[PDB]
């Protein structure tokens, strides 16, 4: 039986930065949702508009697995109607979100002793992101009234900042892997089911 590749999305060697969240299109496969815990105890498991289990029986035309990494304090922003740095400038969910949010701790995975500055996040942006919008622009943000001319300087800052995760950080500042599952309903016949 051709099942869905959740092992690629969840057990990935490297997760993307939150400003460049990675989306995987899942279709033409059987999705096994009755796995409660696949890595560690359930850390963050919040299905909005749908039940967690006893509901894998639903069929959808496509499943969307959006993966990224944030610090624990920001895991609260991956929810409908949230605000903050991530929710505004990095990753936005609609108010009528009918999907699920699965986040877990990765301090053993993404915490380098000398600081893991490979994960970036967007701090500055001229407008809040539309739901499920992605923006990857290494363009100098113009906070002042003078033009930046693509150079960082006085009132001209680079929009990205490194998390610099460290193994000794507090739980609020530790690396957390997040995966958002969206379920699409189209006129086409369903391609993802679990019987």
């Amino acid at each position: 039986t051709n099942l869905c590749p959740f092992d690629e999305v969840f057990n990935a060697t490297r997760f993307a930065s939150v400003y460049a969240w990675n989306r995987k299109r899942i279709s033409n496969c059987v999705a096994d949702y009755s796995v409660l815990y696949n890595f560690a105890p359930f850390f963050a498991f919040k299905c909005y508009g749908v039940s967690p289990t006893k509901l894998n029986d639903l069929c959808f035309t496509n499943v969307y697995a959006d993966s990224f990494v944030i610090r624990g304090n920001e895991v609260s922003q991956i929810a409908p109607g949230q605000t903050g740095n991530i929710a505004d400038y990095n990753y936005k969910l609609p108010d009528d979100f009918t999907g699920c949010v699965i986040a877990w701790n990765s301090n053993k995975l993404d915490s380098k002793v000398g600081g893991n500055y490979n994960y970036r996040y967007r701090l500055f942006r001229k407008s809040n992101l539309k739901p499920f919008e992605r923006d990857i622009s290494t363009e100098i943000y113009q906070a002042g009234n003078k033009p930046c001319n693509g150079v960082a300087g006085v009132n001209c800052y680079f929009p990205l900042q490194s998390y610099g995760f460290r193994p000794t950080y507090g739980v609020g500042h530790q690396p957390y892997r997040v995966v958002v599952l969206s379920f699409e309903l189209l006129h086409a016949p369903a391609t993802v089911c679990g019987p």
Partner: protein
């Protein structure tokens, strides 16, 4: 866009960059202080230099936002913090000379040795030799030798360095729009912008003097009592109406009269409340001590310590293989990393100091949500005041009984209480005239009111007039006795201890009234008082966001420093002294000297 919005965005970028750089510097300095090696010292100095360079870059950047155009108080405070400019306003050579003399004074203080007690091969440093003498010796001549040797050796070297230090620091402070270096130091207490909570830099002097004036009588009676008891100890050496000789006060300077307790104990027949033997007999360890402190803080509504704290900390002596610095310190590294560095032994003193340092840590956790430059006490006295109220609550016999380290049938007579209040006063009230006079002398020197050719003259005049202490041998301008103290020769302000001593009893009074406590203030244990916990947290969470006057009002209900909490804490001892001195002289003549 407005200047305020530009400054806000600048501060966001700054906060996240400085959080990370400060965390690296803190990790490096922790690896040094817990594991003294050469690799660690090089990493610590590298990280610290990186942090200082980043700070100077950010200062030059933040100077571009005209403060006057900022209408948001918080952004104004952070911008001011970046706008220090401190010493940078000096030319390169003058800054180099200032750093040179600072390090030289620090070196001569931490390295000065005096030789030839009998043979020039026997030499002692301040710690532990000279301090052991000044603490335990009962020999007038031995104490005088230690005192005069320390001064005539290290202070004579320190004198010219200190004159140049004064002149350079005044140059810096004046270039930074201050009157003198004393005005710079007093700027820590300045509040400018909040109607009804403002505070000028001279208002500190006014308030400090008005409150020391109110402190004067209790200190006078304590001084008379200690003088009589020392006359019993040094009969042919002490006048019943003169100042106390400076070398008989219990330490190198007289900053604390704690080590005079053996010579001044009211009722030496009563047992002292040292619960060390109980802790040892109950098989307590450092784990249990810090767990009990955590239980104390949780009992008033504050959180436990973090799992990061419990895993990442040195709470015991690491042994002979790994040597570390054992001065108790509370580390707030940022990014939710909280630690305590302490070589804990199973003693009551270490129990109380653990309570003090964990109070520090609770303060740090409580203002963690504040922006970076605002994660600090309201002023320089607040942190130590919080730690000290923790240790006061922990030292009460009521608390000791409730934890099970003191027998339930230990009766608190009025003589164990008078003993306890006297031992508290020797340290707490004995230090206030010392602190005030030293800081007054520095203020006046920086202000240019004491010429160099009578520096020591005014120093000892003030000693006599203010502290009631007289030098055992005369000193000309070759000496520099004020610089023979660590804080003076290492460029640290000193009024913080006075302000913290008044603040701590304000806080204790407020929280014990909140805790519905009954009786004398010194018997108060705020354990199990969620009201007191909340009243303290309302101030702790503020950090340096609100003015220190507002933070103090939040807990005690007053916008200014107050002396009546301290006086109410010491009232029973005050009446006992007033009775004990009925046929004794209270006060002192400023003219008697032990050397004609």
């Amino acid at each position: 866009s407005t200047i305020e919005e530009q400054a806000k965005t600048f501060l966001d970028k700054f906060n996240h960059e400085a959080e990370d750089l400060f965390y690296q510097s803190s990790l490096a300095s922790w690896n040094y202080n817990t594991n003294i090696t050469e690799e660690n010292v090089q990493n610590m100095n590298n990280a610290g230099d990186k942090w200082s360079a980043f700070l100077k870059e950010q200062s030059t950047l933040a100077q571009m936002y005209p403060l006057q155009e900022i209408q948001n108080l918080t952004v104004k405070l952070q911008l001011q913090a970046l706008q220090q400019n401190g010493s940078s306003v000096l030319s390169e050579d003058k800054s180099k000379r200032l750093n040179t003399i600072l390090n030289t004074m620090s070196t001569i203080y931490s390295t000065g040795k005096v030789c030839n007690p009998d043979n020039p091969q026997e030499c002692l440093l301040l710690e532990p030799g000279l301090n052991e003498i000044m603490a335990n010796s009962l020999d007038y001549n031995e104490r005088l030798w230690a005192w005069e040797s320390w001064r005539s050796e290290v202070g004579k070297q320190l004198r010219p360095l200190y004159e140049e230090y004064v002149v350079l620091k005044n140059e810096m402070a004046r270039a930074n729009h201050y009157e003198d270096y004393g005005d710079y130091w007093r700027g820590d207490y300045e509040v400018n912008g909040v109607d009804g909570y403002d505070y000028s830099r001279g208002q500190l002097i006014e308030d400090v003097e008005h409150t020391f004036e109110e402190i004067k009588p209790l200190y006078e009676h304590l001084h008379a009592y200690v003088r009589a008891k020392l006359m019993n100890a040094y009969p042919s050496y002490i006048s019943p109406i003169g100042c106390l000789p400076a070398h008989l006060l219990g330490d190198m300077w007289g900053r604390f009269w704690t080590n005079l307790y053996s010579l001044t104990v009211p009722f030496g027949q009563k047992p002292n409340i040292d619960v060390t033997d109980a802790m040892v007999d109950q098989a307590w360890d450092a784990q249990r001590i810090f767990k009990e402190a955590e239980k104390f803080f949780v009992s008033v509504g504050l959180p436990n310590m973090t799992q990061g704290f419990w895993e990442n900390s040195m709470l015991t002596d690491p042994g002979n293989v790994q040597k570390a610095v054992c001065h108790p310190t509370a580390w707030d590294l940022g990014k939710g990393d909280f630690r305590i560095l302490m070589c804990t032994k199973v003693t009551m003193d270490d129990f109380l100091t653990a309570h003090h340092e964990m109070g520090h840590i609770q303060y740090d956790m409580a203002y963690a949500a504040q922006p970076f430059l605002l994660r600090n006490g309201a002023n320089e006295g607040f942190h130590e005041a919080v730690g000290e109220i923790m240790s006061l609550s922990a030292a009460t016999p009521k608390h000791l009984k409730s934890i099970g380290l003191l027998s339930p049938d230990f009766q608190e007579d009025n003589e164990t209480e008078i003993n306890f209040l006297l031992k508290q006063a020797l340290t707490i009230v004995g230090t206030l005239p010392f602190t005030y006079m030293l800081e007054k002398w520095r203020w006046m020197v920086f202000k240019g009111e004491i010429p160099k050719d009578q520096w020591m003259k005014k120093w000892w005049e003030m000693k006599r007039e203010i502290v009631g202490v007289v030098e055992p041998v005369p000193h000309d301008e070759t000496y520099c006795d004020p610089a023979s103290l660590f804080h003076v020769s290492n460029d640290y302000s000193f009024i913080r201890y006075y302000t913290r001593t008044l603040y701590q009893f304000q806080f204790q009074e407020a929280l014990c009234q909140a805790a519905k406590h009954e009786g004398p203030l010194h018997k108060c244990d705020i354990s199990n008082s969620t009201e007191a916990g909340q009243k303290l947290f309302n101030m702790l969470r503020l950090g340096k966001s609100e003015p220190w006057t507002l933070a103090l009002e939040n807990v005690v209900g007053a916008k200014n420093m107050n002396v009546r909490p301290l006086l109410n804490y010491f009232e029973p001892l005050f009446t006992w002294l007033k009775d004990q001195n009925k046929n004794s002289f209270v006060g002192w003549s400023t003219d008697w000297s032990p050397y004609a």
